Each structure stands twice: as C-alpha cells, then as structure tokens.
Design a protein around this ligand. Sequence first.
Ligand SMILES: NC(=O)c1ccc[n+]([C@@H]2O[C@H](COP(=O)([O-])OP(=O)(O)OC[C@H]3O[C@@H](n4cnc5c(N)ncnc54)[C@H](OP(=O)(O)O)[C@@H]3O)[C@@H](O)[C@H]2O)c1
Ligand SMILES: NC(=O)c1ccc[n+]([C@@H]2O[C@H](COP(=O)([O-])OP(=O)(O)OC[C@H]3O[C@@H](n4cnc5c(N)ncnc54)[C@H](OP(=O)(O)O)[C@@H]3O)[C@@H](O)[C@H]2O)c1
Lengths: 173, 198
Amino acid sequence: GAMGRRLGVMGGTFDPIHYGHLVAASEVADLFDLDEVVFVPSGQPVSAAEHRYLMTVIATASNPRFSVSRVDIDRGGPTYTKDTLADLHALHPDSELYFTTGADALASIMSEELFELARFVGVSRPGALTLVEIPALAISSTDCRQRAEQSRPLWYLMPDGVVQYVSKRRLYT
Amino acid sequence: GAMGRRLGVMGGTFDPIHYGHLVAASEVADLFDLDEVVFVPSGQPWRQVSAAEHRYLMTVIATASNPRFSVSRVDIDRGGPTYTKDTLADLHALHPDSELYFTTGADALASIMSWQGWEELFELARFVGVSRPGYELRNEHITSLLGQLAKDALTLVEIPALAISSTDCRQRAEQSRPLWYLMPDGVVQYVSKRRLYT
Ligand SMILES: NC(=O)c1ccc[n+]([C@@H]2O[C@H](COP(=O)([O-])OP(=O)(O)OC[C@H]3O[C@@H](n4cnc5c(N)ncnc54)[C@H](OP(=O)(O)O)[C@@H]3O)[C@@H](O)[C@H]2O)c1
Ligand SMILES: NC(=O)c1ccc[n+]([C@@H]2O[C@H](COP(=O)([O-])OP(=O)(O)OC[C@H]3O[C@@H](n4cnc5c(N)ncnc54)[C@H](OP(=O)(O)O)[C@@H]3O)[C@@H](O)[C@H]2O)c1
C-alpha cells in the first residue's frame, strides 16, 4: 500500500459472520492502507469449526482483498493470538501485521510480547493499539443466531450465501 | 399472507438506499405478514437530494434480487412536495384489495404525525415506524396522539441495522471511503459511476 506492505488479520469466531464484520474489515483496510485482510476463524475459543470456516469463505469470496486462513483451526488445541501472528508472519514476513478484532475481546487478550509481532486494532459500535468505531457493528452474531433460532429472516444482515448456509445446515435451531 | 392481503409501503428519499433500509423492510415484512413491500422513492423534499431518477435507479438495483420487493414511481412522477396522503391514495388505487402498511423511519413518521390532516392517513393505511438504537420520541403532543389510535394502527420497531444511515453513506462517499458491505455492490457502483456525492 501507500505506507508499505501491510496485512490485516481479522481474528474471530464468526458464528455466524455478517456484514458488520465485513464492513469493519473494509474500514480498517482503508484507514491503515492494508493490502489484504486475512480472516482467521478461531479453532477453539459454538458451531463446529468447518461451518465457521465455510461461512467465512462464502462471505469473503467475492472481495479480491479478503481471504481466509485455517492456521488456528488446523493447529488444534486452544487458540492463542501469539500463534496466529507467528503463523501469519511466517507466510508474509515482509508485511507489517495489523490484528483486528472486537474491542471487548481485545480488552481481555492483554491479560505482552504480542506488541513485538503486530499492531492491534479494536473495533466496536460507537461509545500500537487503536480503537475504531463502526456503526454497522450494531449488527451482531448473537442477534443473527436468535433470528435463525426463531425462524426470522437473515436477509441483508449477511451475504445471501451465508443466509443459505445457515438455513441449509440448520445451524442454530 | 397469514393475516390476509397486506402490502408494505416503504417510503423514503433513499439517497442512497442501504442495507439498513433493506433489513428494515425484510423484518417488517416478516413481523406483519406482508406479501410484498413496494419501495417508494420520495419526490421533492420539504434541502438538496440527488435527482429522482438516480434515487429511483439505486432502489431498483438494490431490490431487484428480492422476489417480494418492488419499486414504484408514484411520488417521483407526481411532482411538488411529496404528501404521504397522495402516496397512499395512488397505491390504494393500484392495489385495491391490499391492506397498506406504510413503513418509514420513526423521525419521519413523527413529522407525518405533526402534519395537519394526519387523521385521514389512518383511514388509508396502518403505520410502522422503524427506529435505530438510541431512538427516543421527545414530543409530548405526539405521545398523546398515540393514545387517539386504534389497536395495531401504528407500531414502533427497533432495527439494529438502521445504525447505518444515508447521511453516513454520503459522507463516506464525499471522503473517498469505501461503501462496500453497507449497501449492495450494484448501489456502491452506481454511486461511483454517477459520481453522486462529489
Ligand atoms: N488468549 C488469546 O490469545 C485469546 C483470548 C480471547 C480471544 N482471542 C482472540 O480474539 C479474537 C476474537 O475472539 P471471538 O470472536 O471468539 O470473541 P467473542 O467473545 O466471540 O466476541 C467478543 C465481541 O467482539 C466482536 N467481534 C469478534 N470478532 C470480531 C471481528 N473480527 N470483527 C468485529 N467484531 C468482532 C463480537 O461480535 P460478534 O459476535 O458479532 O462477532 C463481540 O461483540 C479471536 O481471534 C480469538 O482467537 C484470543
Ligand atoms: N407530511 C407528509 O406526508 C410527509 C412529510 C415528510 C416526509 N414524508 C414521507 O416520509 C418518508 C420519509 O421521508 P424522508 O426519507 O425524506 O425522511 P428523512 O428526513 O430523510 O429521514 C428521517 C429519518 O428516517 C429514516 N428513514 C427514512 N425513510 C426510511 C425508511 N423507509 N426506512 C427506514 N428508515 C428510513 C432516515 O434514515 P436514512 O437517512 O438512512 O434513510 C432518517 O434517520 C417519505 O415517504 C416521505 O414522502 C411525508
């Protein structure tokens, strides 16, 4: 990008992924001049990992600057962000890494050397380490699961392909 | 539908249309058992908006894939300032056997409720005010007006996705910031190709 090789790392459970996440990634990419945003579904932080992976693949497929990595899922065991960053650094060693996730998740992970590996960006609804406010994050995976539980439509909260994956695999019923 | 023939009427300026609007229409359709939602881009405002045809076309682009959404020209072709009374009369004439459910933003519905002659609107349609998070009615006259209304005549529904606003979209466009995932791809491209907020 304009500020050198930079890579977003969008950590999350994504159960399900939705337009709030996609908007957040898109915004964070623009603000920090990122070349790409790798979505990394957590292995073990909840639907099976293959579902969360495929929903993320379906959702990001059409964007040339988004991709999905299985590094946390394929590692096995609990998911640590130091391992995610190590793996992604090994793949893109000439890029500066920008780890992006929900601000609340980011408030907990800091319970040290993580800052040697990456810059951290916390996203939330409004109200080194940077906080970015995203109005579309009023959409949440919790509402999405409840709507699916109650048989209410998910249209326009997420890509059609993800609306259909959730319905076809009966994910939250 | 499950409670009879019902048509959603989704009234707005739509400058631009966004996923908020589309989520709102989809949710109200489900909540009120509506067979169809007709989007009605507004004509002249009561303020500078993009030309009516742009707003018409973004709305067509955005609703095309949905079998239950359509777009009407009745307000853009009437001319003068848009009165929802005229919208409803026109749509009533066109869909004589449907109960109409006029749906718009809660703040706009309050303005409609402030207009002299509001009573005759409820002879033509039921009303749904869609609000975003943090919405509060701060009008004691309008609050008392709600008590004049029959059961199910007016319903308020909070839609988290209406945090996305047309005002924020126009600002993002003005600031060369991406609109991806706030609105359908076709609408992002329309805005860019017609250079709407430059
Ligand atoms: N020890 C560790 O290294 C450790 C510990 C905890 C978390 N983490 C990491 O933190 C990340 C987040 O974990 P999680 O999703 O399981 O947290 P979570 O507890 O499921 O969610 C916390 C909040 O963050 C939001 N959120 C999560 N991921 C997001 C994203 N990428 N973009 C925007 N909002 C997002 C959530 O909204 P939605 O529900 O709508 O997504 C929710 O409001 C993962 O990469 C995980 O590996 C690491
Ligand atoms: N006296 C009258 O009969 C009278 C007077 C005024 C308006 N109206 C009618 O009221 C409707 C709204 O007018 P407008 O768009 O010009 O109002 P507006 O002032 O531009 O909108 C006020 C608020 O309502 C939201 N909103 C508008 N239409 C919406 C919709 N269909 N669904 C969800 N949120 C919506 C707006 O969000 P966004 O910016 O994101 O859309 C904004 O937060 C139109 O059909 C208009 O003809 C009638």
